[PDB]
Design a protein around this ligand. Structure first.
Ligand SMILES: Nc1nc2c(ncn2[C@@H]2O[C@@H]3COP(=O)(O)O[C@H]4[C@@H](O)[C@H](n5cnc6c(=O)[nH]c(N)nc65)O[C@@H]4COP(=O)(O)O[C@H]3[C@H]2O)c(=O)[nH]1
Ligand SMILES: Nc1nc2c(ncn2[C@@H]2O[C@@H]3COP(=O)(O)O[C@H]4[C@@H](O)[C@H](n5cnc6c(=O)[nH]c(N)nc65)O[C@@H]4COP(=O)(O)O[C@H]3[C@H]2O)c(=O)[nH]1
Ligand SMILES: C[C@H]1O[C@H](O[C@H]2[C@H](O)[C@@H](O)[C@@H](O[C@H]3[C@H](O)[C@@H](O)[C@@H](O)O[C@@H]3CO)O[C@@H]2CO)[C@H](O)[C@@H](O)[C@@H]1N[C@H]1C=C(CO)[C@@H](O)[C@H](O)[C@H]1O
Ligand SMILES: C[C@H]1O[C@H](O[C@H]2[C@H](O)[C@@H](O)[C@@H](O[C@H]3[C@H](O)[C@@H](O)[C@@H](O)O[C@@H]3CO)O[C@@H]2CO)[C@H](O)[C@@H](O)[C@@H]1N[C@H]1C=C(CO)[C@@H](O)[C@H](O)[C@H]1O
Lengths: 678, 693
C-alpha cells in the first residue's frame, strides 16, 4: 500500500483529490501509527515516519473522504512524569473536520486499569470511541456575503441548536432539533421579525456525553465538554455523521446569511472532554499530555481552574496554534461571523495572536469575563454587572438608582478609561446561565433537583422576585404583575446603551420550572415551546423596533452630559433636575431620564450628522403609584410610546399626547417612555 | 470631505474611490493626518474616530501618489518616556512607499541640540522622508513560488546595488537597482551558478546615519530600518512615489520565472531613530513607550549591542507590525523567506526566552509566515542569548560554527579534524537532539560580515581604517591565513596557493550536509582590500567587478552542479553510521579505520571520508528509494604532500572527479580512474574526491 512522505502542513487530514495528507503533532511520541478504519471493524495501520518539528506526517494516495481514521501513539506511560501515552487507544485527530459515532462507556476508553489509577490498560478503544473522518472541503457558497452588521445595529439572540427547533410545528420531524432546522424559513422568519441580527449558538463543536450524566439518566445538553474543536457536533445533524454534518452546518450558515443574520459561535477552549486523571483517553491525553494540559504540582493530576476536570496549557505553542487554526477554520471555511469565549501572563500570547490575526481580529470577539472590564479594547464583554443591577432595580434593592443610571448609559465606569465605547457592553437580563426571563419573575430560589447534584449546582444569588408566590399561580394579580415585570426587563434592555442580548424563548415566556442551570436537561424543561405569549411577542418585536429606529438608544460615544448643548439630563419624578443629594435618598426608586436626539455627535458612514427624536424615560420601581411631571415647556408636547403597565402591549399600542409640566401617574414597578420630536 | 472609515488594516489603504488611513498610538491626545502638496504646503485633517487606540478616517478622492504624514499632539515628558511632538511630520510605520531622504539638521530631532530633555519645536516636514499612498495593483500572471525543498537549496547572498552596479550588460539606468536584478544577464548568471535562492541584504527602507553622512560615508548595507513595509527608494531606478514598489515586484516576478526564490534579510530588532539623541522620524513621536524597550530611567533606551534602540518584542502592536510586515512581503511582494536577526541586550533580570516567546508563537502558527523559509542568525558565541543550535525546530540557522571550523581546518589549526567531521556531516551535535534535520544548518565560509573569500586567504588581520572607527569595527579574529604575504602579491607561488585555497573552501562547502550559502562575488574572487566590515563603503571597495571563462567561476559552477547531481551530499537524515548497511566511514590517509586515538592526535590533519550512495534511507516525494553513486573524500589539510591509499577491495575502480590542486579546475576537468589499494599523493592543502557507481 502506497505511502509517501507528504507534508507537515496543514495539520490534520487534507484531501487533495487523489489522496490525503495526514499530519499530527506530538513531541512525546516515540512512534505514531495512522490507523485506517474499515466499515467491517478491521484496521490498516501505516506509520507516520516523516517527522518535522515533532509533527509526523504521511500522504496516502487513494484515501478518500468518508474514510475513518485515528492515531496510535507509541510512547512512555509514566504518569509521575505526566506521560499517559497508550497505544491500545485509537486517538481522535484534534484537527478532525468531522467526527462520527459516540462514546460507549466501558473500560476500553480509559488509559488506566480499573483498579489502579497509575498503571496501564490494554484493551482496544477503537470500537467504543468516536472516530475522525476525512472530509471533502467543497461547498458552493454562491453569493454568500458576511453581514458585517456594526455593533450599534446589533441585537444578539442566544439560542440552542436543538432546543430552538425541537418542538417547532412547521418543520418536518427529521429537521427538528438539527442544523438544517435552523435553515428552515419559519425559524429564519421568526428571527427576522424579532429584529435579531446575530444568532449566537450554544456550543456546536463536537462534544462528549459525560459518563457521569449518562450513568444518571441525563445527558450533556448544553455541550460545554468539547472534544472536537474543528467538527460540528454530530448529534445536531440529520444528514449523517461521516462528513454530512459539515455540509449541514455550512448550509445553515448560508441560509442565515441570505437572511442577513450573523452566526456567532460559543466556543469552549478552556477544557476538553477528557476530564481529570480518572477521565477517559480519547485524544490529547494519549497524544502528548504535557504539551496540551496544565499539570498539577504532582504531574499525575490536572489543574482544574473551572470545575470541568482539566485546563488547556495556554502557553504551549501547539495549543495556541490549534485554537487559532480552529478560529480561522470556523470563520474562513464555515463562514461564521464571531465568537463568544470563556477563558476561565498566561493569556498574553493568546491575546497577541487574536489581535494581529487578519481574519480573527476582524470578526466579533465577545468574552465572558469571569475580569469585568479588563479584556483588551478590541473585546466586547458580557456585562454581568448590568444584569445584576437591572435585576436589583425591579426587585426593589434599595440603593440601585445611582448604579442603574450608569448601566443604563453604557457603564462608563467600566469601559471609558480603557478607551472603549459603550458598544463594548453586551447587556442582558437573562441568558442560558440562570433563570429564564419568566422564571426570574416567578421564583425566589432555584429548583435544580432534577440535575442530580442536590441543588448544589447553579447560581445561588439570582436577584429574583417571585412577585408574591413561589412558582405557578392562579392569582390574576400576580400573573399580571409578572407579565409587566417581564416587560420592564425587556424594555430596560432595549433602551440601554451598549449591545443587547436576548435569550431564546424569552419572547414567548419560556420556563424551565425554576431550574436555573439546565445543562443536563435535553427534554421539555429546556426546549422552546412554540406558541398571552402573543402580547409578550408583540411587545418584544416592537421594543426591538423602537431601538432599531432610534439612534439615541444605540450611540457610538458615551453621553457628554452638561458642558461647563446638553445631551442627557436626570430629573426627579416631580420634575426637578437631580442634585448629588438626590442620588443617595434611601427610597429613591424613581427617575426621569431625558435623552437629547438633537445632540448625537458621532457622524454616520459618510460623515453625515445623525439626528433623532428625543425621549423621556420614566422609571417607577417603588411599590406605590407615583405622579411624574413631564419636565418641559407647557406648550411642548410628548407622545407616550412605551407604557409597561398596559396589559395589551404599549408598544405596539400607541399612547396619548402629554404637555410639559403635566402630571402623569405611573403604576408601581412600571416604565413609560415619551417621544417629543425635536 | 472626511468619513469615519475603518481602523483596519493599518496604514493608507486605497480602494479606487479614495483612501482609508489608520494609525496606532496609545499616548496621543489628538492625531492629525497631514497631506503634503508639491509646494511644501499641507492640508491637515484630524483622525477623530478611535478604536482600541487606532485613529482612523476615510478620505474620498485621495489618490495613489499622495504624500502624507502624521502629527501627534500628546505629552512631551522624557522622564516618563513620552516623546510626542506635533512639530514633527512622522512617517506612517505602515507606509507602502517612502519618498525622499533625511536632510540632517536640528529640525529632525525632538530635542534642542543643547538640552536633551527639552522640546524642539522646529517643523520637520521640509527635512524628513514622507509616506506615499500606493496603488496595490500588479499582474503577477503565471507567477509560481518555486517552493524549493531545503535539500535542493543553494543560497546566494547579494547586495542589490553592489551586485549589478558594475555589470557591463546593463544600461546605466539599471545598474545597482531592483530593475537591474531582473536583467536576463543577471538572472542568467545566477541560473548557471546553480543558485536556487537569492538572499538580498536589507531592502526595507532605511536611513543614511547622520554620523556617516558627517564623515563622507553613508549607510551602504542598510541595517538601519525606518520603513518595514516599503522597498528602499535609493535602489529604485523608476522613482520613489510608488514606482519603487512596482520595480521590486518586477524583480521578484522575473526571478520566479527563472525558478529562483527571493529571501529577504530583515532587521526588526531596532530602528533608525537610534537612542535618545537620535532623530524623531516615526515611532518615537507616535508612541514611544509602546514601540521601544525603555531603560529603568525611561528617558533612555535599552539597546541590542550598539545599534541605539531596541523594539519592544512583548508589545502587541510591535508584534502586529512585524507579522503584518512579514505577511505583506510574502503575500503581496511574493518573497519566499526571511533571514532574521532578533539579537538584543537585556538587563540581567529579563531573559530572551520570555522576550521572544510570543514572537515565535506568532510565527509558528501563522498560515502564511510559517510556510516560507525561516532562517535565524544566532547570538554570537560569547554573549549568549539564542546560541546556534537553540532556535525552535521550525527554524533553520546560519551555522557560525561551520564557518569557524572549516576556516580553522584549512588554516591548519591544531585539533580540528574531530569538529570538522561533525560540521561536514550536518552538525549533529547542534541539531540532532532538538529533533531537527541536517538541513537546519545553513553552512557558509564567508558572508557579508567579515572577509570575502579572496580576502580570507589574503590577509591575517583586517584593514577597516576607511570605515572611520579607528579599526575598531568588525571582527578581530578572522581565522585567516594570507598564504605567505599580507595583501596582494605578484609571487606566482602564493597566487597558486590562494587560488587552490579558494577552491578548498568552495568544495568543502558544496560537499557538506546542510544548506550551502554563497557570498556574492566569491565566484569572481571579489576583494574588499582587506576591509572586513564594509557597511559604510558604497563604492568600489564593495561593488562586484564582473569579468570579461575564469577558472574559479568554472570550478564553482561545476561544484554546485556536482552537489545538485548527487543526493548523498544533501541528505534529509543524519548519517546512521556503523550499526545494522554502513552509510559513512572514516579512514586515515594510509587507509584504515579511524580509532578514537586518531581523532585527537596533534598530527591529525588529513582524512578520507566514505559516503555510501546505496545507503540513503529517506524516500523521495513519491516514496521511492533514493539512490546515488558512492564517494571518497580525501582531505589533505596538512602542509606537506601526503600519500593516500584508496580504502576499497582489490579490484574496484573509482573516478577522480574533484582535485583542487589542478589549476585549470577539476571539475569541470575530468581526472583518471584509480583502483582500491592504490597509493596517490595529494598536494599540501588540497582536496580530492573519488566517485564509484
Ligand atoms: N526531524 C527529523 N529527523 C530525522 C528523521 N529521520 C532521521 N532523522 C534523523 O536521522 C537520523 C538517523 O535516521 P535513521 O537512518 O533512519 O536511523 C534512526 C531510525 O532507524 C530509527 N528511528 C528514529 N525514529 C524513528 C521512527 O520514528 N520510526 C522508525 N521506523 N525508526 C526511527 O532509529 C535511528 C536513529 O534515530 P535518531 O536518534 O532519531 O537519529 C535520526 C534522526 O536524528 C525525520 O523523519 N525527521
Ligand atoms: N476633537 C476631538 N475631541 C476629543 C477627542 N477625544 C476626546 N475628545 C473631546 O473631549 C470630550 C471628552 O472626551 P472623553 O473623555 O474621551 O469621553 C469620550 C469618550 O470616552 C467617548 N468616545 C468618544 N469618541 C470616541 C471614539 O472615537 N472612539 C472611542 N473608542 N471612544 C470615544 O465619548 C465620550 C464623549 O466624547 P464626546 O461627546 O465627543 O466629548 C469629548 C470630545 O469633545 C479627540 O480625539 N478629538
Ligand atoms: C464537569 C462539571 O459538569 C457540570 O458543570 C456544568 C455547569 O453546571 C454548567 O453551568 C455549565 O457551565 C458552563 C457555563 O454554562 C458557560 O456559560 C461557560 O462559561 O462554561 C461553563 C463551565 O464550562 O457547564 C458545566 C458542564 O460542562 C457540573 O455542575 C459540575 O459540578 C461538574 N464538575 C464535576 C467534575 C469532577 C471532575 O471530573 C470534579 O472536578 C468536580 O468537582 C465535579 O463537581
Ligand atoms: C550604529 C552602528 O553602526 C555601525 O554598526 C554596523 C556594523 O558595523 C555592521 O557590521 C552591521 O552590523 C549588522 C550585521 O552586518 C548583520 O549581520 C546583522 O546581524 O545586524 C548587525 C547590526 O545591525 O551594521 C551596523 C550599522 O548598520 C558601527 O560599526 C557601530 O559602531 C554603530 N554603533 C554606534 C551608535 C551609537 C548610538 O547611536 C552607540 O550606541 C554605539 O556605541 C556606537 O558605536
Amino acid at each position: 500500500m502506497q505511502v509517501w512522505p507528504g507534508q507537515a502542513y496543514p495539520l490534520g487530514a487534507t484531501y487533495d483529490g487523489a489522496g490525503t495528507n495526514f499530519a499530527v503533532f506530538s513531541e512525546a511520541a516515540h512512534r505514531i501509527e495512522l490507523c485506517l478504519l474499515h466499515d467491517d471493524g478491521s484496521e490498516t495501520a501505516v506509520e507516520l515516519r516523516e517527522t518535522d518539528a515533532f509533527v509526523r506526517h504521511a500522504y496516502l494516495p487513494g484515501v478518500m473522504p468518508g474514510q475513518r481514521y485515528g492515531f496510535r501513539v507509541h510512547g512512555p506511560y509514566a504518569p509521575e512524569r505526566g506521560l499517559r501515552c497508550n497505544a491500545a487507544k485509537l486517538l481522535l485527530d484534534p484537527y478532525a473536520r468531522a467526527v462520527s459515532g459516540r462514546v460507549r462507556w466501558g473500560e476500553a476508553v480509559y488509559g488506566y486499569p480499573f483498579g489502579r489509577p497509575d498503571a496501564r490498560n490494554d484493551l482496544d478503544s477503537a470500537p467504543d470511541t468516536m472516530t475522525s473522518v476525512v472530509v471533502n472541503p467543497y461547498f458552493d457558497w454562491g453569493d454568500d456575503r458576511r453581514p458585517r452588521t456594526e455593533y450599534h445595529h446589533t441585537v444578539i439572540y442566544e439560542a440552542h441548536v436543538k432546543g430552538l427547533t425541537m418542538l417547532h410545528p412547521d418543520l418536518p420531524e427529521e429537521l427538528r432539533g438539527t442544523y438544517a432546522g435552523l435553515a428552515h424559513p419559519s425559524v429564519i422568519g421568526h428571527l427576522r421579525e424579532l429584529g435579531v441580527t446575530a444568532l449566537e449558538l450554544m456550543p456546536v463543536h463536537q462534544f462528549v456525553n459525560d459518563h457521569r450524566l449518562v450513568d444518571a439518566g441525563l445527558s450533556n445538553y448544553w455541550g460545554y465538554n468539547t472534544i472536537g474543536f474543528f467538527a460540528p457536533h454530530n448529534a445536531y445533524a440529520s444528514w449523517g455523521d461521516r462528513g454530512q454534518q459539515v455540509l449541514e452546518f455550512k448550509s445553515a450558515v448560508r441560509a442565515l446569511h441570505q437572511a442577513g443574520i450573523e452566526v456567532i459561535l460559543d466556543v469552549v477552549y478552556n477544557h476538553t472532554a477528557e476530564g481529570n486523571h480518572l477521565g477517559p483517553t480519547l485524544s490529547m491525553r494519549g497524544l502528548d499530555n504535557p504539551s496540551y494540559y496544565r499539570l498539577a504540582d504532582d504531574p499525575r493530576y490536572y489543574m482544574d481552574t473551572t470545575g470541568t476536570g482539566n485546563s488547556l496549557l495556554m502557553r504551549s505553542p501547539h495549543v495556541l496554534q490549534l485554537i487559532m487554526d480552529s478560529l480561522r477554520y470556523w470563520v474562513t471555511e464555515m463562514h461564521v461571523d464571531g465568537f463568544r469565549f470563556d477563558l476561565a501572563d498566561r493569556l498574553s500570547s493568546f491575546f497577541d495572536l487574536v489581535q494581529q490575526d487578519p481574519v480573527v481580529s476582524q470578526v466579533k470577539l465577545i468574552a465572558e469575563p469571569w475580569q469585568v472590564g479588563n479584556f483588551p479594547p478590541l473585546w466586547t464583554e458580557w456585562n454581568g454587572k448590568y444584569r445584576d443591577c437591572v435585576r436589583d432595580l425591579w426587585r426593589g434593592e434599595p440603593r440601585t438608582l445611582a448604579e442603574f443610571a450608569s448601566r443604563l448609559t453604557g457603564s462608563s465606569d467600566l469601559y471609558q478609561d480603557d478607551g472603549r465605547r459603550p458598544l463594548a457592553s453586551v447587556n442582558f437580563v437573562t441568558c442560558h446561565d440562570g433563570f429564564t426571563l419568566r422564571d426570574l419573575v416567578s421564583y425566589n430560589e432555584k429548583r435544580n433537583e432534577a440535575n442530580g447534584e442536590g441543588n448544589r449546582d447553579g447560581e445561588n444569588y439570582n436577584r429574583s422576585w417571585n412577585c408574591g408566590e413561589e412558582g405557578e399561580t392562579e392569582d390574576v394579580g400576580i400573573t399580571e404583575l409578572r407579565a409587566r415585570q417581564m416587560r420592564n426587563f425587556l424594555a430596560t434592555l432595549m433602551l440601554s446603551q451598549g449591545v443587547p442580548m436576548l435569550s431564546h424563548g424569552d419572547e414567548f415566556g419560556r420556563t424551565q420550572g425554576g431550574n436555573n442551570n439546565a445543562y443536563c436537561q435535553d427534554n421539555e424543561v429546556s426546549w422552546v415551546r412554540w406558541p398571552a405569549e402573543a402580547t409578550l411577542l408583540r411587545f418584544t418585536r416592537s421594543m426591538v423596533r423602537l431601538r432599531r429606529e432610534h439612534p439615541v438608544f444605540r450611540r457610538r460615544r458615551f453621553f457628554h452630559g452638561r458642558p461647563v448643548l446638553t445631551d442627557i439630563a436626570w430629573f426627579t419624578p416631580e420634575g426637578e433636575e437631580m442634585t448629588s443629594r438626590d442620588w443617595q435618598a434611601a427610597h429613591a426608586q424613581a427617575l426621569t431620564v431625558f435623552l437629547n436626539g438633537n445632540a448625537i455627535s458621532e457622524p454616520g458612514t459618510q460623515g453625515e450628522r445623525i439626528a433623532d427624536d428625543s425621549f423621556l424615560l420614566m422609571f417607577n420601581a417603588s411599590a406605590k403609584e407615583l405622579e411624574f411631571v413631564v419636565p418641559d415647556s407647557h406648550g411642548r408636547y410628548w407622545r407616550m410610546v412605551v407604557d409597561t403597565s398596559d396589559p395589551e402591549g404599549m408598544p405596539p399600542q400607541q399612547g396619548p399626547e402629554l404637555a410639559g409640566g403635566e402630571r402623569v401617574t405611573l403604576a408601581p414597578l412600571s416604565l413609560t417612555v415619551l417621544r417629543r420630536p425635536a
